[PDB]
Design a protein around this ligand. Structure first.
Ligand code: ATP
Lengths: 155, 195, 416
């Protein structure tokens, strides 16, 4: 069953998909239609149906959003680290929390994935892997250093 | 080492004064007889001289560009490659830049509850790249040969200098294949060096 | 002979190369020398910095940037060489030659020969380093020009006590590659790295900003008590790093644009400074955020136009981007440059889209638009609108036509 906020989030994403599918001059879209709006629920149902919940969470709407829109470190691990750290910084900045260093960011991320670590030997590899992700962001100025340094979202 | 360098000179080009001018800094810079002997035995400074001779080549200029400049260069190269004549303009370049930024953002999954720079800010990047000769106007003759040709060129008014900044036609100097040769794979935009 | 070398940062190789090719004895220096590098590379800075440490070298400075064409460039050489020789060795009796008589390079050679003959009484042979900055920056320029100054001093008599030793500076690489066979000694300047640009700006434009009147106000206004010069230096330095890291992908690696951005944003950043803002530059960043979110290089309902003018400009865009095939069907290539059209099409489409006949106000608005240059024609001088050869095209982007259509409630979005 769709939760009430999921309806609010679904109409947000349907507007976003209808925005992207919009042609540059004509208003007529070609790929995203009302059938796809049902598809988002229909896919979200199946995604939720794969687990033990009868309440569709906003997360399962995003998963259907990704799959319908899509039409050294591994690429998936890199981006997964990005969406976790980037939203962490934006959350504390918008809430005005105290500043945190890069090491604290690494420790925070490892805390989030405690169960994915099969052994403490894997701990050091992932911890070492984490700093490479940070440096890549600084390398292309995705997270600006402020002089220990504090990381702030770049424009 | 000196004999190897002399052999390389002989194989490459056979104008002796070039080798003379190459040697002159080695003698001039020497401060002591021991330093002179060590330098002429190691013969390493000719490599520095040669790389400085190559520092303002295409690779040397390309290594100095910024992230946004490099991305816009890649997008312009892609448009040039897709075009039948290789021509492109600012509008198509910015459209491709927006499209590739959208694609990169899309491949990043959205979280349950990278900047597309404004078209006005990209103007400075375009101006930078046009001056560094990565681009060139459609039929730019460039430096004229003689004074009379320069007179007739300065008398005439080319259309490319009158039409708006967003619609001037350009052609590319570094083809996308050369970019993929040169651009490090560690670059975020490297994956787009292919079509 | 020995020449001291200034410690120019990030140009050490080139400073050593200029320690070479430049010495008191004219038998140990070449006839020509070229230093090359694009704008904002430090060549004009480095060359003057090297000459300012060795006064005994007799240097003459000229700039083709000011000297529009080759005639001023020739005349200035004679003028400045003569004046410099008078300034250095005044006691020798000489006779003046008018620099305005130098109408040809041969006459330049003649005048130089005459002047050196007048100084023949000198005991020792000495160098004369004629310096030209940005040779390719000359506006009236052609390829054949530079050979005339390459192969110049060999027409001078080698017995002369004064020998000219040319030095050139160049920007473009396409200029050098036409003269590689001459094997002229070349010293190259590559574009600075970001780590170099940031440090160059910190070393150069820090103290100048540190003591400006704007801070002279704010320090007293905020009643800062424990302030010292070191705190001033650090606070000013943080600004350059912030601007560089914010606008590096926009400016690139150019010192000039970064300096201009610093100049514009420095008073506004200083304005946000309070008692609690210093000793925590992070708060300074977190309060002047909007300075770092927009370039602010912009010079400043954007167009306020008559309704007739608005519909004329809608119809002209339709003419410029709709293929002529559809005029008989629709009414009965954005990225490309606009195509040309005729007034006969514009009038018909305007009549077909306005919610007018042929009163003079329509043509008056059209001519106003042309004078406003919102619509372009196929000519540059002696505009002859009524001549049939002239054709018309739109000089306005789509982003403004869309707003005009919104303001007149028109639906151009449905015709494409
Ligand atoms: N090593 C350096 N240290 C400090 N400042 C430097 C250095 N190199 C260059 N600059 C700065 O570069 C600025 C621009 O002068 P520069 O010599 O680079 O011009 P240019 O490239 O000859 O210009 P143009 O082609 O317009 O004549 C100078 O104001 C100077 O402060």
């Amino acid at each position: 069953i769709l939760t009430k906020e999921a309806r609010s989030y679904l109409v947000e994403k349907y507007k976003e998909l209808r925005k992207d599918d919009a042609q540059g001059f004509s208003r007529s879209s070609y790929r995203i239609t009302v059938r796809q709006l049902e598809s988002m629920i229909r896919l979200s149902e199946a995604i939720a149906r794969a687990n033990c919940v009868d309440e569709i969470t906003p997360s399962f709407i995003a998963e259907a959003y990704d799959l319908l829109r899509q039409s050294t470190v591994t690429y998936d691990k890199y981006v997964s680290m990005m969406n976790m750290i980037v939203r962490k910084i934006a959350e504390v900045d918008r809430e005005g929390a105290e500043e945190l260093t890069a090491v604290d960011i690494v420790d925070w991320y490892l805390l989030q994935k405690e169960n994915d670590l099969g052994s403490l030997a894997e701990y050091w590899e992932e911890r070492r892997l984490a700093f490479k992700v940070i440096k890549r962001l600084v390398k292309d100025r995705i997270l600006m250093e402020i002089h220990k340094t504090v990381y702030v979202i770049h424009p | 080492n000196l004999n190897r360098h002399i052999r390389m000179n002989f194989e490459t080009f056979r104008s002796l004064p070039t080798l003379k001018n190459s040697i002159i800094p080695l003698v001039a810079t020497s401060k002591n007889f021991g330093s002179l002997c060590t330098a002429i035995k190691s013969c390493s400074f000719l490599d520095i001289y040669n790389k400085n001779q190559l520092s303002n080549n295409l690779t040397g200029r390309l290594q100095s560009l910024s992230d946004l400049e490099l991305a816009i260069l890649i997008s312009a190269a892609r448009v040039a490659l897709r075009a039948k004549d290789g021509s492109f303009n600012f509008n198509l370049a910015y459209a491709e830049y927006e499209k590739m930024i959208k694609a990169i953002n899309s491949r990043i999954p959205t979280v349950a509850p990278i900047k597309l720079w404004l078209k006005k800010d990209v103007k400075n990047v375009w101006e930078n790249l046009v001056q560094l000769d990565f681009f060139t106007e459609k039929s730019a003759v460039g430096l004229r040969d003689n004074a009379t040709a320069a007179f007739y060129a300065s008398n005439y008014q080319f259309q490319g200098t009158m039409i708006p900044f967003d619609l001037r036609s350009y052609q590319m100097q570094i083809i996308l294949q050369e970019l993929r040769r040169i651009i490090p794979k560690s670059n975020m935009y490297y994956s787009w060096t292919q079509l | 002979m020995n020449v001291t070398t200034p410690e120019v940062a990030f140009r050490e190789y080139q400073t050593n190369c200029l320690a070479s090719y430049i010495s008191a004895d004219p038998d140990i220096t070449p006839s020509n020398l070229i230093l090359q590098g694009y704008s904002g590379t430090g060549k004009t800075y480095t060359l003057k910095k090297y000459f300012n440490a060795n006064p005994n070298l007799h240097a003459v400075w000229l700039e083709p940037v000011e000297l529009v064409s080759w005639k001023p460039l020739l005349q200035a050489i004679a003028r400045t060489v003569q004046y410099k020789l008078k300034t250095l060795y005044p006691n020798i009796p000489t006779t003046d030659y008018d620099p305005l008589q130098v109408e040809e390079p041969f006459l330049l050679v003649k005048t130089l020969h005459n002047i050196f003959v007048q100084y023949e009484s000198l005991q020792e042979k000495t160098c004369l380093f004629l310096i030209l900055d940005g040779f390719d920056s000359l506006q009236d320029l052609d390829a054949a020009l530079f050979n005339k100054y390459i192969k110049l001093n060999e027409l001078l008599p080698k017995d002369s006590k004064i020998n000219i030793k040319f030095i050139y500076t160049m920007l473009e690489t396409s200029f050098l590659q036409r003269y590689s066979t001459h094997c002229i000694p070349t010293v190259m300047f590559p574009r600075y790295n970001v780590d170099e640009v940031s440090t160059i700006l910190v070393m150069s434009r820090c103290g100048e900003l540190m003591e400006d009147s704007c801070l002279r106000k704010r320090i007293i206004e905020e009643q800062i008590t424990d302030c010292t010069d070191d705190q001033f230096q650090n606070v000013a330095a943080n600004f350059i790093h912030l601007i560089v890291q914010a606008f590096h992908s926009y400016t690139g690696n150019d010192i000039f644009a970064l300096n201009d951005l610093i100049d514009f944003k420095w008073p506004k950043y200083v304005s946000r400074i309070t008692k609690e803002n210093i000793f925590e530059p992070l708060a300074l960043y977190k309060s002047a955020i909007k300075l770092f979110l927009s370039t602010d290089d912009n010079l400043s309902q954007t167009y306020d136009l008559s309704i007739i003018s608005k519909y004329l400009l809608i119809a002209s865009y339709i003419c410029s981007y709709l293929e002529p095939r559809y005029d008989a069907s629709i009414f009965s290539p954005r990225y490309l440059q606009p195509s040309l059209f005729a007034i006969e099409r514009l009038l018909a489409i305007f009549q077909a889209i306005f919610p007018m006949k042929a009163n003079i106000e329509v043509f008056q608005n059209l001519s106003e638009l042309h004078t406003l240059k919102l619509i372009a024609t196929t000519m540059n001088k002696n505009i002859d609108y009524l001549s049939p050869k002239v054709r018309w095209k739109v000089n306005v982007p789509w982003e403004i036509i869309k707003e005009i259509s919104e303001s007149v409630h028109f639906n151009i979005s449905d015709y494409f």
